[PDB]
Amino acid sequence: TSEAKRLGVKRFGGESVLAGSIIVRQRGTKFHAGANVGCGRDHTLFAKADGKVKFEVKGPKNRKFISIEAE
Amino acid sequence: DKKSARIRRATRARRKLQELGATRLVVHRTPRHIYAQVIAPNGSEVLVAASTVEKAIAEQLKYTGNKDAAAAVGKAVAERALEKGIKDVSFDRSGFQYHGRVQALADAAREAGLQF
Amino acid sequence: AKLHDYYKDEVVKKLMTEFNYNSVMQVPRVEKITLNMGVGEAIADKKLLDNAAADLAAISGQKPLITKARKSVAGFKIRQGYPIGCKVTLRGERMWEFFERLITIAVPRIRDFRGLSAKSFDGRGNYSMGVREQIIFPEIDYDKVDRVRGLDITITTTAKSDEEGRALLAAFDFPFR
RNA sequence: UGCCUGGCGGCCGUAGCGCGGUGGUCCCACCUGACCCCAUGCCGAACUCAGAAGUGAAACGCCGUAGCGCCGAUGGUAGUGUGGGGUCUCCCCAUGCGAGAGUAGGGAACUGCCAGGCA
RNA sequence: UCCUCCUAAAGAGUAACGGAGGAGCACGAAGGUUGGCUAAUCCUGGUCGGACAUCAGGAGGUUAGUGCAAUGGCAUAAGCCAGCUUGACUGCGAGCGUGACGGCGCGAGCAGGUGCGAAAGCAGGUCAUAGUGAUCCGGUGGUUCUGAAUGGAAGGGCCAUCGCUCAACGGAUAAAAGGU
RNA sequence: CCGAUGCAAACUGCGAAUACCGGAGAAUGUUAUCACGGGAGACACACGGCGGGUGCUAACGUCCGUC
């Protein structure tokens, strides 16, 4: 005895995010990609096709999943 | 821990095929009987299922579980798929090894003219 | 195979008569025997460990695998991954033959043969014991002895209590304590 | 159409943890030997070849045990947006939204499709 | 110059030489893919080993680890044995998240050709968050693209690109350094 | 160190109000919304209320987010 990075959710549930849009950019893996959602090298979730976003809880561990469904 | 490990290992392909959302052919192997099922992408319905136990195909088979039975099941699955219009389903090994009866069944199914 | 039939004929029958069981295989069965060396004196020299592994392979029907260290502590002056010893697993005809030959020739001829220590149990049925002077085993000759080394023989036991293990040991009359 | 067994999905502790009983009709389970397809970072450990010759040991389906664990109310409590007041560091007033835990209650799950045995 | 949690009032952002250090490296294997495996921690048995130099029966299931100081998520391990390779290749690339710009990051998908497989499919470096170089200057190879009449040559214009601790790291004119 | 009672900025098996993103909706608001072009103007703000940091949780001291 710097420049802060921009975190948080950019598009929330109900947004008509089109293909290529990134849903959230988090440090680690806060949420896991579900249907029609891809995960990048830097632990970033992005959409693969047009649709409405949704967040769901499933699995023995009760893990949060980000999914996209047809509008 | 054998069945749990088998399920865990099969879960890899089980989830992998989900993203592409294509009909899947799964095989359950047991010395007593062999089962083959065609499952739709939604995963809650089966297009067609065959079992070595059924007499319809066990009449000509000396024993329910063997290479000949696997080949017969493969042929039956292939012809049913051809007459139903599966449109080139994918397949999963269900965590088994593709060297014995699984390979024989796959070859028998492909012999009909499938493109999986 | 060779001894399994006799075991079923005699030991299983005796245990069933003694304990009034129902299932034919209610009596616990031995699955595998693990031969290990607890010498722990091959740190300085690797040729000692190599010769010990060769002796293990010669006595057994299969060669051993070298095992590395698990944790590193400054108290005992040990690093991580340091090869010290090896183990052999026997399950099947080889295991039956090895057990038969042992109980036939090796066990009777032991110096200070005060009997097996039944108290040396894991608390659930598995029995592990070690003895010195591998020269007792006929598979090793006096002309090819480098040093005195101990053994560690552990038998698999599926029982849920020590009474079953004691009965299994008494199956061969358990000469004495 | 009813009982039992195996597989494919949803539900993910109202599905779990501990205890007693039952399951060989069918199904499932222990695999003996492997010089033969397959191989061990040693081991036929797993996988592959022949079933009732040996049985339900362990695993798993079901009933009860509400013992542990979970959810779960109405109500209250702590807090806060808005305007005002006081002894203004903090609190109160009219109004809206409303904690956690626990109590009543529940459950030893349920549900959709396919294969087999007994009816 | 850049990262790591708070103060920072549950989107982002939001202070004072604020509280805190680390990186300016490294792996051309620590990269890709197929099979299987996956604890740590503690009790009990071994010649000593008692837990602590190795082995097997249990308590318990992600408390060990993930190249780094630290950080989040990670048992479908994002680890760890057996095998083969270089997809860390080339032209690219709709769109999205940031910005004042210079620009930065992710990114579905096509084509030319490859590795992992029987296939489904993965491979545009490393689990990630820092780990570097912009303008100008000097050097290499291609282009008749251009060439002050003609045919060349010299010199420029663009393509991959080394040096430039340029480590004053957006880098102020050609102006050498230390002090009472 | 074994179990428990209370506590926390680099503590959450739980979890507000409040803020913010999208969809639908009766009504008001001189389109008050967004796109392009011309013209500018300003680039030491002060104080107060609300919740904090700093300060010796002494200071009509200091800096923040909102009105």
XYZ file of C-alpha atoms (C1' of nucleotides) in Angstrom:
730
model
C 0.000 0.000 0.000
C -8.930 2.079 -14.469
C -12.006 1.789 -16.707
C -14.927 -0.152 -15.253
C -16.356 -2.828 -17.530
C -20.027 -2.719 -18.518
C -21.792 -5.738 -16.995
C -25.433 -6.624 -16.353
C -28.387 -7.619 -18.494
C -28.864 -5.598 -21.679
C -31.987 -7.385 -22.971
C -34.511 -8.792 -20.500
C -37.411 -11.202 -20.885
C -39.952 -10.338 -23.556
C -37.451 -8.550 -25.805
C -37.634 -9.501 -29.486
C -33.889 -9.997 -29.810
C -32.906 -10.984 -33.346
C -30.136 -13.339 -34.444
C -26.644 -12.383 -33.293
C -27.708 -10.221 -30.349
C -25.932 -10.912 -27.057
C -28.403 -11.355 -24.210
C -26.040 -10.810 -21.257
C -22.293 -10.356 -20.742
C -21.228 -11.653 -17.320
C -17.853 -12.379 -15.757
C -18.312 -16.127 -15.347
C -21.403 -18.192 -16.188
C -24.342 -16.685 -14.312
C -26.832 -18.276 -16.726
C -26.547 -21.162 -19.184
C -27.681 -21.109 -22.801
C -30.798 -23.159 -23.483
C -32.632 -23.421 -26.807
C -31.444 -21.340 -29.774
C -28.832 -19.673 -27.524
C -25.077 -20.009 -28.025
C -22.185 -19.520 -25.600
C -18.958 -17.804 -26.641
C -15.369 -18.361 -25.581
C -15.534 -15.461 -23.100
C -18.657 -16.898 -21.405
C -21.093 -14.693 -23.336
C -24.606 -15.788 -24.315
C -25.972 -14.784 -27.724
C -29.134 -15.492 -29.688
C -29.190 -17.733 -32.758
C -32.586 -16.809 -34.244
C -35.354 -14.250 -33.895
C -37.723 -14.811 -31.000
C -38.773 -13.845 -27.500
C -36.421 -14.315 -24.548
C -37.259 -16.200 -21.363
C -35.490 -17.249 -18.164
C -36.243 -20.659 -16.656
C -35.213 -22.734 -13.633
C -34.647 -26.454 -14.184
C -32.382 -29.276 -13.093
C -31.499 -30.963 -9.800
C -29.238 -28.013 -8.945
C -31.934 -25.498 -10.012
C -29.720 -23.785 -12.581
C -30.901 -20.688 -14.437
C -31.251 -21.129 -18.207
C -31.756 -18.497 -20.912
C -33.979 -19.622 -23.789
C -35.545 -18.134 -26.916
C -38.972 -19.191 -28.197
C -40.884 -18.441 -31.381
C -42.918 -15.240 -31.147
C -22.273 -47.388 -10.119
C -23.002 -48.743 -13.608
C -26.474 -47.629 -14.722
C -25.894 -44.105 -13.402
C -22.590 -43.882 -15.284
C -24.232 -45.209 -18.454
C -27.018 -42.627 -18.217
C -24.514 -39.838 -17.547
C -22.368 -40.806 -20.537
C -25.391 -41.103 -22.838
C -26.574 -37.692 -21.618
C -23.792 -36.135 -23.704
C -25.314 -37.137 -27.043
C -28.801 -36.816 -25.533
C -28.280 -33.086 -24.978
C -26.101 -32.590 -28.066
C -28.817 -33.774 -30.454
C -31.310 -31.463 -28.722
C -29.761 -28.284 -30.143
C -30.094 -29.567 -33.715
C -33.574 -30.867 -32.876
C -33.592 -33.968 -35.085
C -35.305 -37.322 -34.674
C -32.995 -39.743 -32.863
C -32.615 -43.528 -32.922
C -31.651 -44.924 -29.507
C -30.767 -48.510 -28.602
C -31.051 -50.201 -25.200
C -28.881 -53.311 -24.851
C -29.417 -56.181 -22.418
C -28.335 -59.838 -22.676
C -31.983 -60.908 -22.417
C -33.464 -58.398 -24.882
C -32.579 -55.496 -27.180
C -34.781 -52.441 -27.760
C -34.662 -49.776 -30.480
C -36.719 -46.577 -30.322
C -37.177 -43.549 -32.585
C -37.731 -40.381 -30.540
C -38.917 -37.043 -31.890
C -36.959 -33.857 -31.096
C -39.471 -32.867 -28.404
C -38.407 -36.006 -26.527
C -41.885 -36.950 -25.270
C -43.068 -39.173 -28.154
C -41.584 -42.205 -29.911
C -42.125 -42.597 -33.652
C -41.634 -46.381 -33.578
C -40.231 -48.924 -31.123
C -39.081 -52.522 -31.553
C -38.067 -55.126 -28.983
C -36.435 -58.534 -29.341
C -38.936 -59.962 -26.838
C -41.881 -59.732 -29.238
C -42.693 -63.070 -30.846
C -43.327 -61.441 -34.235
C -39.547 -61.186 -34.708
C -38.441 -63.698 -32.049
C -40.040 -66.653 -33.868
C -37.157 -66.946 -36.352
C -34.532 -66.128 -33.686
C -33.133 -68.923 -31.529
C -32.538 -66.499 -28.640
C -33.852 -62.998 -28.018
C -30.426 -61.438 -27.439
C -27.652 -62.100 -29.959
C -26.065 -60.718 -33.119
C -28.752 -62.289 -35.315
C -31.477 -60.745 -33.150
C -29.755 -57.357 -33.340
C -29.567 -57.615 -37.135
C -33.247 -58.578 -37.335
C -34.216 -55.644 -35.105
C -32.135 -53.324 -37.269
C -33.824 -54.568 -40.437
C -37.281 -54.184 -38.884
C -36.501 -50.658 -37.679
C -35.116 -49.728 -41.099
C -38.139 -51.014 -43.020
C -40.604 -49.401 -40.603
C -38.710 -46.116 -40.924
C -38.754 -46.395 -44.719
C -42.512 -46.993 -44.789
C -43.156 -44.215 -42.234
C -40.943 -41.497 -43.742
C -38.476 -40.732 -40.953
C -36.338 -38.593 -43.303
C -32.828 -39.636 -42.202
C -32.950 -39.655 -38.422
C -29.736 -39.285 -36.466
C -28.617 -41.998 -34.042
C -27.188 -42.240 -30.532
C -25.127 -45.070 -29.055
C -26.711 -44.650 -25.588
C -23.257 -44.767 -24.002
C -22.448 -48.207 -25.425
C -19.424 -49.275 -27.485
C -19.787 -49.411 -31.275
C -17.916 -52.677 -31.815
C -20.347 -55.564 -31.208
C -24.117 -55.963 -31.322
C -24.580 -52.184 -31.542
C -22.378 -52.083 -34.643
C -24.184 -55.094 -36.112
C -27.571 -53.430 -35.590
C -26.326 -50.168 -37.106
C -24.970 -52.001 -40.157
C -28.236 -53.917 -40.537
C -30.221 -50.674 -40.381
C -27.948 -48.973 -42.918
C -28.176 -51.969 -45.263
C -31.807 -51.125 -46.060
C -30.667 -47.843 -47.624
C -30.752 -45.330 -44.785
C -28.447 -42.297 -44.846
C -27.743 -41.746 -41.146
C -12.455 -72.545 -10.720
C -10.135 -75.212 -9.326
C -10.821 -74.137 -5.728
C -14.187 -72.425 -6.284
C -15.996 -75.767 -6.533
C -14.479 -76.993 -3.262
C -15.289 -73.662 -1.610
C -18.934 -73.932 -2.663
C -19.051 -77.574 -1.563
C -17.577 -77.053 1.916
C -17.328 -73.456 3.157
C -20.694 -72.295 1.810
C -22.388 -75.404 3.204
C -20.786 -74.932 6.625
C -21.708 -71.241 6.779
C -25.289 -71.962 5.706
C -25.645 -74.681 8.343
C -24.156 -72.415 11.017
C -26.092 -69.204 10.314
C -29.378 -70.520 8.827
C -29.304 -68.347 5.711
C -31.823 -68.262 2.862
C -30.076 -67.105 -0.324
C -27.515 -69.531 -1.733
C -24.988 -66.688 -2.051
C -26.061 -65.115 1.252
C -22.548 -65.948 2.471
C -20.168 -63.115 1.478
C -17.776 -63.961 -1.349
C -14.191 -62.790 -1.808
C -13.881 -60.671 -4.954
C -10.244 -59.569 -5.279
C -6.935 -59.658 -3.422
C -4.676 -56.595 -3.534
C -0.942 -57.247 -3.187
C 0.921 -54.125 -2.065
C 4.340 -53.179 -0.710
C 4.623 -50.847 2.264
C 8.419 -50.783 2.263
C 8.599 -47.020 1.752
C 12.409 -47.223 1.542
C 12.879 -46.819 -2.233
C 13.003 -43.008 -2.077
C 16.803 -42.915 -2.283
C 17.225 -45.663 -4.905
C 15.001 -46.394 -7.903
C 16.690 -49.706 -8.728
C 15.354 -51.084 -5.438
C 11.799 -50.255 -6.518
C 12.437 -51.674 -9.992
C 13.730 -54.952 -8.542
C 10.788 -55.128 -6.132
C 8.350 -54.629 -9.016
C 10.137 -57.325 -11.022
C 9.857 -59.693 -8.052
C 6.145 -58.903 -7.726
C 5.627 -59.618 -11.426
C 7.567 -62.884 -11.162
C 5.620 -64.138 -8.139
C 2.254 -63.033 -9.546
C 0.704 -63.762 -12.927
C 0.746 -60.097 -13.957
C 3.177 -57.206 -13.720
C 2.521 -54.303 -11.319
C 1.905 -50.643 -12.117
C 4.064 -47.925 -10.578
C 2.005 -45.588 -8.387
C 2.918 -41.951 -7.782
C 2.515 -39.834 -4.663
C -0.753 -38.141 -3.684
C 0.148 -35.162 -1.467
C 3.320 -33.207 -0.715
C 4.308 -32.379 2.870
C 7.481 -30.718 4.134
C 7.400 -32.761 7.345
C 8.305 -36.048 5.652
C 10.358 -34.443 2.842
C 8.138 -35.623 -0.015
C 7.048 -33.927 -3.238
C 3.947 -34.497 -5.382
C 3.860 -37.345 -7.882
C 6.897 -39.138 -6.446
C 6.849 -42.849 -7.417
C 7.485 -45.035 -4.369
C 5.446 -48.230 -4.661
C 3.083 -50.337 -6.753
C 0.046 -52.592 -6.415
C -1.328 -55.744 -8.036
C -4.986 -56.795 -8.208
C -5.916 -60.479 -8.499
C -9.468 -61.612 -9.284
C -10.247 -64.954 -10.913
C -8.418 -68.212 -11.575
C -5.074 -66.552 -10.847
C -6.415 -65.258 -7.526
C -7.757 -68.691 -6.574
C -4.463 -70.389 -7.450
C -2.451 -67.782 -5.539
C -4.647 -68.134 -2.448
C -4.458 -71.932 -2.612
C -0.667 -71.950 -2.930
C -0.329 -69.418 -0.108
C -2.600 -71.194 2.377
C -0.944 -74.480 1.384
C 2.790 -73.758 1.650
C 3.536 -70.184 2.721
C 1.330 -69.769 5.803
C 2.569 -72.801 7.820
C 6.248 -71.761 7.610
C 6.469 -68.415 9.416
C 8.915 -67.459 12.156
C 7.212 -66.686 15.475
C 4.002 -68.252 14.139
C 1.794 -67.033 16.974
C -1.246 -67.015 14.674
C -3.168 -64.434 12.687
C -4.277 -61.207 14.382
C -8.062 -61.181 14.063
C -8.145 -57.753 15.727
C -6.513 -56.368 12.549
C -9.824 -55.759 10.787
C -11.060 -52.640 9.014
C -14.221 -52.831 11.146
C -16.565 -53.955 8.353
C -15.227 -57.306 7.096
C -12.220 -56.589 4.889
C -8.996 -58.159 6.171
C -5.571 -56.679 5.401
C -2.369 -58.147 6.822
C 1.357 -57.976 6.169
C 4.263 -60.336 6.786
C 8.012 -60.183 6.198
C 10.579 -62.453 4.533
C 9.160 -62.996 1.058
C 11.767 -65.784 0.888
C 9.077 -67.988 2.454
C 7.228 -67.957 -0.870
C 8.684 -70.663 -3.163
C 8.474 -68.373 -6.213
C 11.505 -66.407 -4.931
C 14.835 -68.179 -4.431
C 17.490 -67.336 -1.856
C 20.080 -66.790 -4.603
C 18.024 -63.855 -5.937
C 17.310 -61.932 -2.713
C 18.297 -58.259 -2.500
C 16.831 -57.315 0.898
C 14.075 -58.152 3.367
C 10.736 -56.708 2.243
C 7.228 -56.916 3.652
C 3.906 -57.655 1.981
C 0.366 -56.312 2.281
C -2.431 -58.719 1.330
C -5.960 -57.302 1.525
C -9.031 -59.396 0.687
C -12.344 -58.016 -0.557
C -15.289 -58.615 1.786
C -18.876 -57.685 0.917
C -20.139 -58.338 4.455
C -21.767 -55.635 6.570
C -20.427 -57.018 9.871
C -17.255 -58.488 11.349
C -19.005 -61.746 12.287
C -19.163 -62.723 8.612
C -15.454 -62.008 8.208
C -14.632 -64.060 11.295
C -16.706 -66.953 9.943
C -14.960 -66.719 6.568
C -11.557 -66.794 8.269
C -12.607 -69.755 10.428
C -13.708 -71.526 7.236
C -10.087 -72.696 6.927
C -10.155 -73.436 10.710
C -8.188 -70.242 11.568
C -5.307 -72.213 13.166
C -5.109 -69.937 16.226
C -4.758 -66.341 17.395
C -59.882 -52.300 -19.304
C -57.057 -53.494 -13.925
C -52.030 -55.268 -11.229
C -46.522 -55.833 -11.921
C -41.709 -54.952 -14.605
C -38.197 -51.993 -18.256
C -37.399 -47.699 -21.471
C -38.416 -42.606 -23.463
C -40.024 -36.829 -21.426
C -42.083 -32.939 -18.038
C -41.932 -31.922 -12.849
C -36.576 -31.307 -9.573
C -36.581 -32.260 -2.024
C -45.247 -32.281 -1.934
C -39.667 -36.441 -6.071
C -34.723 -36.207 -0.851
C -32.173 -38.708 4.043
C -32.844 -42.939 8.199
C -35.863 -47.648 9.532
C -39.253 -52.514 8.783
C -41.764 -55.680 5.112
C -42.523 -57.483 -0.036
C -40.754 -58.492 -5.464
C -38.572 -63.941 -9.444
C -45.159 -64.793 -13.385
C -42.487 -61.473 -16.915
C -38.594 -57.872 -16.734
C -34.014 -56.395 -14.221
C -29.643 -57.989 -11.278
C -24.483 -61.441 -9.572
C -20.807 -63.942 -15.245
C -18.547 -68.502 -14.194
C -14.299 -69.125 -18.914
C -12.495 -66.106 -22.716
C -6.428 -68.958 -25.907
C -11.851 -66.259 -30.082
C -14.406 -58.705 -32.009
C -12.895 -55.749 -27.670
C -8.556 -54.402 -23.263
C -6.331 -52.997 -18.588
C -2.140 -46.260 -16.875
C -1.666 -54.152 -12.811
C -6.663 -56.339 -12.623
C -12.201 -59.337 -17.936
C -11.934 -52.679 -13.139
C -15.663 -51.156 -17.263
C -16.980 -52.831 -21.937
C -17.977 -57.756 -25.785
C -19.378 -63.482 -26.530
C -23.389 -68.218 -24.150
C -28.983 -68.070 -19.478
C -31.511 -70.487 -16.066
C -26.772 -74.542 -14.789
C -26.709 -71.847 -9.527
C -30.046 -67.145 -6.563
C -32.584 -62.236 -5.387
C -26.621 -61.451 -2.061
C -25.812 -56.153 -3.425
C -28.481 -52.691 -6.610
C -33.553 -51.137 -7.968
C -39.885 -51.077 -8.276
C -43.951 -50.727 -4.138
C -46.448 -50.211 1.148
C -45.885 -48.058 5.987
C -42.736 -45.299 9.646
C -44.054 -37.533 9.187
C -38.131 -39.512 12.843
C -34.702 -35.559 9.741
C -35.422 -32.414 5.579
C -39.074 -28.838 2.033
C -42.842 -25.834 0.700
C -46.411 -23.151 2.796
C -50.583 -19.621 4.235
C -54.029 -15.249 6.580
C -51.872 -12.288 10.315
C -47.960 -9.520 12.394
C -43.018 -7.649 12.229
C -38.493 -4.769 9.991
C -38.316 -1.470 5.491
C -39.478 1.905 1.695
C -41.914 5.710 -2.799
C -44.706 10.064 -2.281
C -46.409 15.274 1.028
C -45.871 17.116 5.893
C -44.162 17.529 11.133
C -40.992 16.956 15.436
C -36.801 17.252 20.391
C -34.369 16.789 12.866
C -27.608 12.241 14.695
C -33.273 9.771 14.448
C -38.586 9.219 14.712
C -43.914 10.029 13.574
C -48.329 11.187 10.672
C -52.554 10.015 5.687
C -51.804 6.466 1.752
C -49.575 2.324 -1.579
C -46.143 -1.890 -1.829
C -44.634 -5.282 1.600
C -39.204 -9.006 4.933
C -36.862 -13.742 6.963
C -38.106 -17.612 10.404
C -42.029 -20.206 12.695
C -47.358 -21.800 13.564
C -52.301 -24.379 10.717
C -51.792 -27.844 6.165
C -49.265 -31.367 2.784
C -46.706 -35.037 1.213
C -42.744 -41.552 1.777
C -45.099 -37.699 -4.984
C -47.639 -36.834 -9.701
C -48.146 -36.886 -14.857
C -47.687 -38.173 -21.060
C -45.905 -42.236 -24.630
C -43.734 -47.360 -25.994
C -42.354 -52.929 -24.874
C -43.322 -57.441 -21.916
C -45.950 -61.088 -17.874
C -50.576 -62.030 -14.950
C -55.991 -60.850 -15.604
C -0.721 1.231 -20.067
C -4.112 -2.640 -18.208
C -6.993 -6.126 -14.630
C -8.796 -7.940 -9.847
C -14.259 -7.094 -4.626
C -16.094 -2.972 -1.967
C -17.308 1.742 -0.712
C -21.140 2.798 -5.332
C -28.284 3.907 -2.610
C -30.458 -4.804 -5.860
C -29.846 -2.229 -14.984
C -24.851 0.305 -16.634
C -22.213 4.442 -14.800
C -21.261 7.344 -10.512
C -14.896 10.680 -5.162
C -10.882 12.589 -3.207
C -1.663 9.500 -4.346
C -9.656 5.413 -1.633
C -9.117 0.717 0.742
C -5.896 -3.865 -2.075
C -1.907 -6.084 -5.159
C -0.815 -8.265 -9.773
C 0.434 -8.339 -15.379
C 3.417 -6.433 -18.465
C 4.393 -13.194 -18.649
C 3.942 -18.078 -20.226
C 2.244 -22.684 -23.275
C 4.006 -23.309 -30.550
C 1.921 -27.120 -25.939
C -0.809 -25.925 -21.003
C -4.222 -25.923 -28.573
C -8.526 -29.306 -31.240
C -11.156 -33.617 -30.987
C -12.839 -39.792 -29.440
C -13.150 -43.511 -25.085
C -13.202 -43.836 -20.194
C -12.207 -41.770 -15.558
C -13.355 -37.597 -11.788
C -12.768 -36.040 -5.721
C -11.171 -33.110 -1.531
C -11.565 -33.958 3.523
C -11.675 -37.750 8.032
C -12.026 -42.980 10.636
C -10.479 -47.935 10.283
C -6.561 -51.963 8.580
C -1.297 -52.794 6.950
C 6.895 -54.216 8.081
C 7.225 -48.272 9.549
C 2.632 -45.580 8.149
C 0.161 -43.486 12.880
C -3.744 -39.309 8.634
C 0.760 -37.236 7.066
C 6.869 -41.717 1.702
C 2.510 -46.398 -0.999
C -2.200 -49.884 -0.867
C -8.031 -51.083 0.463
C -13.233 -50.929 3.335
C -15.844 -46.948 4.784
C -17.938 -40.989 6.596
C -19.085 -37.202 2.749
C -20.224 -35.152 -3.162
C -17.894 -30.889 -5.431
C -14.576 -27.801 0.752
C -9.185 -30.232 -3.754
C -8.487 -27.710 -8.814
C -9.031 -24.051 -13.210
C -0.531 -21.903 -15.224
C -0.508 -16.849 -12.680
C -1.568 -12.157 -7.084
C -6.900 -11.758 -6.781
C -11.886 -12.620 -8.887
C -16.915 -16.128 -11.080
C -19.027 -19.887 -12.568
C -17.469 -24.656 -13.130
C -19.243 -33.216 -11.529
C -22.731 -32.322 -18.446
C -16.132 -30.442 -14.649
C -14.703 -25.080 -17.744
C -10.203 -31.362 -14.931
C -7.322 -36.020 -16.184
C -5.000 -41.111 -18.495
C -4.938 -43.520 -22.992
C -4.181 -41.626 -29.182
C -3.745 -38.610 -33.840
C -2.997 -34.024 -35.506
C -2.046 -28.443 -36.040
C -8.735 -25.194 -37.357
C -3.670 -20.758 -33.799
C -5.290 -22.226 -42.063
C -7.328 -18.667 -46.198
C -11.379 -14.995 -48.142
C -14.807 -13.626 -45.201
C -18.891 -12.696 -42.318
C -25.461 -10.727 -41.243
C -25.944 -8.965 -36.244
C -25.094 -7.466 -31.237
C -22.458 -5.076 -26.621
C -19.447 -0.461 -26.064
C -17.559 4.048 -27.002
C -16.007 11.226 -28.554
C -12.815 9.252 -32.409
C -8.820 6.187 -33.547
C -11.560 1.542 -32.852
C -12.238 -2.947 -29.265
C -14.903 -7.728 -27.971
C -18.510 -11.750 -29.120
C -20.772 -13.599 -33.220
C -24.793 -17.357 -36.430
C -23.404 -18.727 -41.511
C -20.827 -19.878 -47.051
C -16.817 -21.196 -49.892
C -11.062 -23.774 -50.885
C -8.571 -27.518 -48.208
C -7.431 -30.268 -43.479
C -7.295 -33.009 -38.038
C -10.508 -35.677 -34.357
C -15.035 -40.114 -35.568
C -18.571 -45.236 -37.667
C -21.602 -40.962 -37.437
C -24.167 -37.115 -34.952
C -20.759 -32.785 -34.635
C -16.128 -29.835 -32.834
C -11.785 -27.198 -34.304
C -11.012 -18.905 -36.985
C -5.686 -20.790 -30.114
C -4.879 -21.407 -24.612
C -11.714 -21.430 -19.125
C -11.935 -16.260 -18.844
C -11.219 -11.186 -16.569
C -4.352 -7.648 -17.537
C -0.339 -9.565 -20.375
C 0.936 -4.757 -25.122
C 2.183 -0.689 -29.939
C -1.005 3.365 -32.668
C 1.330 7.811 -36.058
C 6.032 8.577 -38.111
C 10.831 6.545 -39.443
C 14.566 2.417 -41.656
C 14.701 -3.006 -43.979
C 12.519 -7.735 -46.968
C 9.186 -10.140 -51.463
C 5.108 -9.249 -55.377
C 2.707 -5.951 -58.818
C 4.491 -2.295 -65.222
C -0.603 -0.181 -60.746
C 1.924 4.188 -62.086
C 6.400 5.721 -65.107
C 7.618 13.811 -67.058
C 8.283 11.079 -75.796
C 9.464 5.916 -77.192
C 11.664 0.614 -74.814
C 14.000 0.292 -69.931
C 15.856 2.294 -65.432
C 15.241 5.531 -61.051
C 11.215 7.051 -57.872
C 6.161 6.567 -55.774
C 0.694 3.351 -54.676
C -1.103 -1.074 -52.249
C -0.502 -5.741 -50.479
C 2.201 -9.934 -45.427
C 5.304 -7.540 -42.766
C 10.867 -7.038 -38.825
C 13.173 -2.977 -35.765
C 10.899 1.357 -33.207
C 10.647 -0.995 -23.544
C 8.384 4.269 -29.356
C 7.263 0.661 -20.950
C 6.726 9.593 -21.799
C 2.539 2.969 -23.336
C -3.198 7.929 -28.108
C 2.404 7.954 -28.085
C 2.915 17.158 -27.662
C 8.031 20.984 -32.765
C 14.769 18.728 -35.166
C 16.094 20.859 -30.430
C 21.268 16.940 -23.910
C 21.185 15.465 -19.183
C 21.477 15.918 -12.861
C 21.293 19.767 -8.185
C 21.595 23.305 -3.573
C -10.000 -27.629 17.899
C -15.790 -30.467 19.065
C -21.326 -28.178 19.453
C -23.797 -23.603 20.284
C -25.002 -18.296 21.106
C -24.418 -12.948 18.435
C -21.787 -10.064 14.510
C -19.540 -8.535 8.829
C -17.138 -3.708 3.089
C -13.249 -8.442 -0.909
C -20.753 -13.685 3.472
C -25.725 -15.448 1.667
C -29.458 -22.434 2.169
C -33.805 -16.783 1.711
C -35.161 -11.993 0.081
C -38.209 -6.146 -0.209
C -39.769 -1.047 -1.559
C -37.532 1.425 -5.300
C -35.000 1.856 -10.552
C -34.693 -0.132 -15.296
C -36.030 -3.427 -20.402
C -40.125 -5.499 -23.447
C -45.648 -6.751 -24.638
C -51.095 -5.141 -24.142
C -54.464 -1.366 -22.528
C -59.222 3.401 -21.364
C -57.674 8.790 -21.248
C -54.674 13.602 -21.540
C -50.486 16.097 -23.231
C -50.415 22.302 -29.703
C -45.594 15.355 -31.295
C -44.205 16.759 -25.731
C -40.694 11.004 -29.557
C -37.003 9.987 -33.251
C -33.851 11.210 -38.250
C -31.058 15.224 -41.211
C -29.225 20.232 -41.940
C -27.877 25.849 -40.340
C -27.064 28.760 -36.081
C -25.341 29.126 -31.787
C -24.749 29.662 -26.593
C -21.815 27.259 -22.104
C -17.091 24.066 -20.540
C -14.228 27.095 -11.803
C -21.623 26.676 -10.215
C -23.732 27.662 -4.860
C -27.111 26.038 -1.212
C -30.828 22.897 0.636
C -33.877 17.829 1.307
C -33.171 12.539 0.680
C -28.926 7.528 1.632
C -23.739 7.215 2.333
C -18.047 7.702 2.292
C -14.186 10.768 4.463
C -13.327 13.276 8.983
C -11.878 12.012 16.103
C -19.487 8.023 13.873
C -16.541 16.550 17.892
C -16.834 20.417 13.109
C -22.288 25.677 9.682
C -15.407 20.519 7.252
C -14.930 17.400 2.727
C -16.889 14.333 -1.926
C -20.796 11.498 -4.057
C -26.378 9.262 -6.758
C -31.343 11.752 -7.037
C -34.990 16.252 -6.535
